[PDB]
């Protein structure tokens, strides 16, 4: 028999083991030539494998790079002391100077001089708790911020807008050191020389900052550098926590207002500006020298041909550009990925072909902004919007060894907990259990009893531009940490197969587990005779993420008063999709006809479509999904979010509520109109 | 039986005379008590006739209408005279003061006083010679154009542009009174007490002004009419060329450039600035006192459910909103849509169904900017873009009586020159002919020995929001008159029953010819098993509008050397459409399969919609067609051609070659990517 069971039971740990190990020997940075090598290593596996077609999809694209005879560093000034070079390797690892050194990708030239100012988490609240609470003044100072709690993009656009002329990101151990793990090689701990990578763009979903709406293709006319979307103003560079000391140990001026601007380093973590009396003259200099360089990369599309519907996709697509050696980011979700293709292949060559197309996709240049999945679906768009059932994304199959995390549409939410209790647990304890069992135990839903947490799908990795711009049903799973107690290494050197194979996963079942879930949900959602989306599971959401908007609004009882702020159509249209749904979902049970069930996986299909609004979100023309899109200024319907957010500091309050209320006239109406998409057709 | 010739046989002339004197009696000015009760006399007529579900849309939009108790009009001043406060109105009718006195819709209020200038048409290239060659500057004074050659809300752009202070609009014989025809009652001409209305407004495709984007419904929220889209920002009155003639009289300063800037009157036509030296101290006042006022305005919506694809919507639409008695406009269309809908009554009766949901549409408040249409397109913008097959037009039956005259997409090239071929002539001269045979003779092709002329869709009727914002393919047809000799009583209270009946279609048989055209081609488009496109069709047209923007660029050779301007990717996208296209129509003709037919039904629907920019045009979000879209400086392929015009006077023209790159680059990106949609799917 070629049914699920026969998929999943050929999926083998050891053969993702194998995968890993040989994704990771060498670093694989976007835009390099052992990446392209690896790109045709896949491509020629693939095709080995046995898919229909696999092709190479390549663009050129706006990449940053340190400068290999300039290096970047930070001082205290005569330069008294010096950040590192590069990270200590880690035991064995010989081809060092390819290794890019840490660097925070797309920051300008430059080398501010300044005294320091400490910004916490550079949070938008850390910057209102600066200027508004504690009245402290960035502009033209260098912030020293920690990595956490948001992309750092944010922070350095948040300091932006503060008006500093730096910013150095250091990765603190209150956030990066788990009590009582030893610090790699001999744990999975972060060590002092330790330094988080990352890209600070603000791209708003864009894509390739040259080419915002088309493909960087062969022909493309591209913005000039000063004309493009994204790219930070002021130098930026992240340092260690030995370094971090060093620079944070001389802080003078204000203390912290609270324990919570405290981390666990020892130093007062006073905020500034500058530093105490003896040392009240020295100053922090930056040297950045990196450059943005438009570079080619490479897509891998694999494609298995659907026997019934193949103009219908079902996309399995996850990164393989790593900042070194991507030993967790994201060559365990790429091992994955291709044990998932293998065994996919595997009943392929019995003479198995899936209901619906599979397309599997190995992106380029995720850690430079999600610009590889990005140009693809550019290019591809009008194939994508009319026929893309769904987007499963595969980047770290781990990020902990504790318990499942699903971030998906509602759409997805019955898929996923019915294919969960069909699968073993791997977890210590629930031998003999079902992962479901295992995964709500250790993750309740805040809200319901016997379900698990399942989250909303956001920004950040790339499922972003199918989600939240093409409005294709989107779903991630991983095997994640104990919320209580990211992950220490991430985006550092010491992201290695021996902290794979040693400190997370020796036995390599939560990979297998992982492969599972996210191989179990394409075998669905591309075999399933009818879509496996519940339409109800939209409506009940809808109507939380109503009561919490109307719930943030009456915080400003006068003013609704005032500019008769009314959510009642937001209501009504919340209350009509719950009915429309519930009658579709009786039609859906109740009826041979293939035009009739593709009429109905048409509506299912095209339901995710609906919240696509043309216009966008104001001044966001690529976050087009009215339910889900990230706020500007990070809940769900942000377009009303972002209206009501600070409303209260706003000159003109006439003109404030008047675009919370058009707000609420987009969302109802968007509601309704999805709602409509599942009536009658005639 | 029941086919196309049952469908056809069952229409008659007979019917289509009752319901057009029954349509006419009365005025039915958009928002008024007497159209809402068309509305609902229509309404219950086509369930009578047989329709599945017949509804009502409504909307409230902003809509225009003179003061009745404080008349618009215009003075030479002392006031020594006056234009007239109404036309005349025709022999035997009635209820006078309800007939609405002439006016130019959405006019601010005002009393502008001043000096008269003479524009011509006020075109583009008009308004270039007047103040490049001439010298003559029309800042502070009022410009008197006459009405024809573009859409007035342009003259009305194009002057306050130029700085004028108002406009009045007339109608010159030269334009509007044909030689030895006699002026109505007693013939079809315009008499001199005779004047056009019609809106003046710019509003690029946006629908009501006040809601861009979203239906105007009960909850909307509404744009300031500071805010508003496409309004006019000086006062505004058309007059008839008996008052023109008074105010033209009188008129000095530089004589008229050439004789194309003459009309017909006994009057010298100079150009001004003011009159004459004994009159030089008079002026020129308008006195404009009309109000804009958001009103209710009634679409009918009737549906007849497909058997076999439900899901797929042919959609046949013409307004019913008219200036006075609409005996040509709209009423000799909606007389035709009538007949059409009791013919697929009749068969619907016997037990037939088409194959695809038809639905029949009857539109309000056409005449103040495409508003009905635009606010329902907008409202089920969803359901059209993902189910709609094609749209048919449905205004005015007849302008004429010498042939027929058709404007559609290409994909429909082969669905009219088929059908036509199975006609009738109506024409005398043609009889026993074909209506093909008749229409190829009357208007060759510019291009093709043996082939009618068919000619492109703009802008200006209820197609536009279908086709130019959501890429449906479309198409019109009416009779048309002899463009070599729009028609004299255009918007005129002359426009009556028995305009039509005495003077251009007695007998009601070139109404029943284009009651067979449009009927017909709704009912392969809805019936036909394979959709009625030839996508080879879209190539060969594609091919010649690039030939002709790269002449118009070419004749800037130095500049396309300097800046390195290439149509080499257009050209390529062109070829490979050509090619693929080819590939798709060998497939389409040879292949029982009905999920292979309906994936290649829609590839043929998608294929017009794969021509949509979800960017749409620069600053005209709502025009998307990459192919079609209005110039916003009125060819095809718009984007490029505003980018080439008037290139020459740019400041900075690296910059205006740049940007006309970046058009090309789009243009080759969408038709490659149009050609993709008709690959193999996987
Ligand atoms: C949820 O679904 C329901 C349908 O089950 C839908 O109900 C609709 O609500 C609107 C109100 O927003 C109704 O609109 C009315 O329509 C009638 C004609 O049918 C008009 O006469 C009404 O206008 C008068 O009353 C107004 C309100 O006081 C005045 O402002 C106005 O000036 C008029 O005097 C009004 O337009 C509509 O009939 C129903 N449709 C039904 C029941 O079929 C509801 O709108 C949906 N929710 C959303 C968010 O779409
Ligand atoms: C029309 O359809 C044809 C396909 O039949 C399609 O041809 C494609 O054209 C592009 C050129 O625009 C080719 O792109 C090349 O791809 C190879 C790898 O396959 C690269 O090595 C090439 O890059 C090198 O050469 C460039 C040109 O001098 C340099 O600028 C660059 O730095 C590199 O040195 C280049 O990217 C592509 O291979 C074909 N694809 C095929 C034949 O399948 C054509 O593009 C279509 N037209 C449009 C408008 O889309
Ligand atoms: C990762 O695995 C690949 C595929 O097995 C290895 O690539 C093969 O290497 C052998 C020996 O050089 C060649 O003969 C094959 O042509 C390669 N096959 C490909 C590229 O498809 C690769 O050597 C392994 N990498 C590491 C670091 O172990
Ligand atoms: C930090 O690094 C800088 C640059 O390498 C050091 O300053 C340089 O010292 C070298 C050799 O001693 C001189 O040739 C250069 O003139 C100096 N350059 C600059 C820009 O100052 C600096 O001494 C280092 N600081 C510490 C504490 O090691
Ligand atoms: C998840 O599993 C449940 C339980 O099997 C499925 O719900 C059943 O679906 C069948 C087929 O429609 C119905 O006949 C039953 O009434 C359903 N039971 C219920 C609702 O309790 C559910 O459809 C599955 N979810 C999927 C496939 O997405
Ligand atoms: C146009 O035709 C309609 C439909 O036949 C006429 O409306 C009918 O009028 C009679 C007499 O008043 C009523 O009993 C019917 O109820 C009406 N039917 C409808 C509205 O569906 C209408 O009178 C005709 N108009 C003119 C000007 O001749
Ligand atoms: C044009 O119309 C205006 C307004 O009706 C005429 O001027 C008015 O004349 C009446 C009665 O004779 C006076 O009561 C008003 O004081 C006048 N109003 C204004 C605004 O001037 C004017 O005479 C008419 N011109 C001609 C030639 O008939
Ligand atoms: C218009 O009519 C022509 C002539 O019948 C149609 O072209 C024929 O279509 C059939 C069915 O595909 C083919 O077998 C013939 O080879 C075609 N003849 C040609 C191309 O000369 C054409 O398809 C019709 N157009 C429509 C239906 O849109
Ligand atoms: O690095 C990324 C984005 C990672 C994010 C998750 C994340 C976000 C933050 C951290 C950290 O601060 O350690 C770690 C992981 C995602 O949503 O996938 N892509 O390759
Ligand atoms: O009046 C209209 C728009 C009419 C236009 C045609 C047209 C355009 C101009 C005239 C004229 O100047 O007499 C006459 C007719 C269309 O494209 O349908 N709609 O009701
Ligand atoms: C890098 O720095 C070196 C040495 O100072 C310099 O010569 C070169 O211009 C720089 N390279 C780039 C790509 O900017
Ligand atoms: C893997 O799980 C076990 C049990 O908690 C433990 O030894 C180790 O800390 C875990 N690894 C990580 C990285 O959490
Ligand atoms: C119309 O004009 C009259 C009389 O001068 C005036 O009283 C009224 O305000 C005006 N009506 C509108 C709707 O502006
Ligand atoms: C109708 O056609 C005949 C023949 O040309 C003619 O008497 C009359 O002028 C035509 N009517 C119109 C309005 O063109
Ligand atoms: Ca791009
Ligand atoms: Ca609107
Ligand atoms: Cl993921
Ligand atoms: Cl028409
Ligand atoms: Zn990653
Ligand atoms: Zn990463
Ligand atoms: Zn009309
Ligand atoms: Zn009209």
């Not at 006439?654 to 009536?679: C, D, N, P």
């Amino acid at each position: 028999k070629h049914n699920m069971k026969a998929f999943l039971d050929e999926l083998k740990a050891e053969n993702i083991k194998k995968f890993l190990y040989n994704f990771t020997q060498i670093p694989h940075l976007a835009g390099t030539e052992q990446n392209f090598q690896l790109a045709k290593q896949i491509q020629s596996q693939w095709k080995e494998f046995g898919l229909d077609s696999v092709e190479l999809a390549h663009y050129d694209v706006l990449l940053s790079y340190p400068n290999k005879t300039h290096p970047n560093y930070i001082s205290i000034i005569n330069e008294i002391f010096n950040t590192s070079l590069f990270e200590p390797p880690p035991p064995g690892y010989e081809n060092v100077s390819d290794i890019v050194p840490p660097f925070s990708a797309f920051s300008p030239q430059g080398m501010p001089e300044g005294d320091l100012v400490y910004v916490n988490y550079a949070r938008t609240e850390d910057f209102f708790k600066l200027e508004r609470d504690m009245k402290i003044n960035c502009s033209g100072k260098i912030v020293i911020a920690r990595y956490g709690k948001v992309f750092r993009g944010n922070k350095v656009k948040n300091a932006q807008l503060a008006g500093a002329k730096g910013v150095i990101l250091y990765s603190d151990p209150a956030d990066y050191f788990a009590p009582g793990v030893k610090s790699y090689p001999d744990g999975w701990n972060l060590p002092g020389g330790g330094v988080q990578r990352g890209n600070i763009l603000n791209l708003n979903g864009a894509g390739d900052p040259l080419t915002p709406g088309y493909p960087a293709n062969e022909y493309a006319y591209r913005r000039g550098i000063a004309e493009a979307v994204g790219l930070p103003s002021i130098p930026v560079h992240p340092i260690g926590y030995y370094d971090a000391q060093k620079l944070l140990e001389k802080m003078g001026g204000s203390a912290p207002p609270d324990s919570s601007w405290r981390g666990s380093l020892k130093v007062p973590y006073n905020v500034g500006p500058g530093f105490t009396g003896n040392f009240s003259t020295q100053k922090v200099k930056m040297h950045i020298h990196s450059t943005n360089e438009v570079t080619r990369i490479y897509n891998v599309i694999g494609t298995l041909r659907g026997a019934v519907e193949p103009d219908r996709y079902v996309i399995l697509g996850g990164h393989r550009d790593s900042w070194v050696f991507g030993g967790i980011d994201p060559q365990s979700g790429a091992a994955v990925v291709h044990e998932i293709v293998r065994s996919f292949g595997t009943l392929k060559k019995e003479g198995w072909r899936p209901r619906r197309t599979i397309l599997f996709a190995s992106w380029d240049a995720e850690e430079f902004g999600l610009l590889g999945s990005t140009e693809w679906a550019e290019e591809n768009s009008r194939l994508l919007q009319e026929r893309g059932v769904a987007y499963i994304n595969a980047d770290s199959s781990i990020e902990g060894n504790y318990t499942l995390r699903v971030d998906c549409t509602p759409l997805m939410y019955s898929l996923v907990h019915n294919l969960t209790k069909e699968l073993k647990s791997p977890d210590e304890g629930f031998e003999g259990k079902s992962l479901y069992e295992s995964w709500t135990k250790k993750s309740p839903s805040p809200e319901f009893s016997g379900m698990p947490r399942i989250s909303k799908l956001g920004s950040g990795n790339d499922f972003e531009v199918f989600f939240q711009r093409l409005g294709i049903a989107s779903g991630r799973a991983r095997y994640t940490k104990n919320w209580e107690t990211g992950y220490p290494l991430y985006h550092s050197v010491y992201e290695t197969y021996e902290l794979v194979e040693k400190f997370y996963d020796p036995m390599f079942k939560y990979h297998l587990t992982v492969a599972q879930v996210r191989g179990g949900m394409v075998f669905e959602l591309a075999n399933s005779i009818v879509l496996p989306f519940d339409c109800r599971d939209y409506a009940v959401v809808l109507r939380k993420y109503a009561d919490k908007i109307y719930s943030i609004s009456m915080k400003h009882p006068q003013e609704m008063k005032t500019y008769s702020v009314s959510f009642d159509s937001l209501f009504s249209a919340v209350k009509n999709f719950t009915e429309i749904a519930s009658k579709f979902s009786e039609r859906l049970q109740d009826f041979s006809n293939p035009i009739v069930l593709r009429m109905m996986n048409d509506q299912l299909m095209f339901l995710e479509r609906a919240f696509i609004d043309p216009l966008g979100l104001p001044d966001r023309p690529f976050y087009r999904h009215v339910i889900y899109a990230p706020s500007s200024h990070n809940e769900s319907f942000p377009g009303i979010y972002d209206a009501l957010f600070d409303i209260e500091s706003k000159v003109d309050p006439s003109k404030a509520w008047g675009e919370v209320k058009r707000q609420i006239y987009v969302a109802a109406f968007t509601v309704q109109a999805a709602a409509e998409t599942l009536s009658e057709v005639a």
